[PDB]
Amino acid sequence: GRPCYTLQSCFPD
Numbered sequence: 093g094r095p096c097y098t099l100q101s102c103f104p105d
Contacts, residue, residue: 093105
């Protein structure tokens with residue numbers, strides 16, 4: 093649902 097941006101390239105949720 094919400095944007096997930098991290099160092100390991102988080103997935104969307």
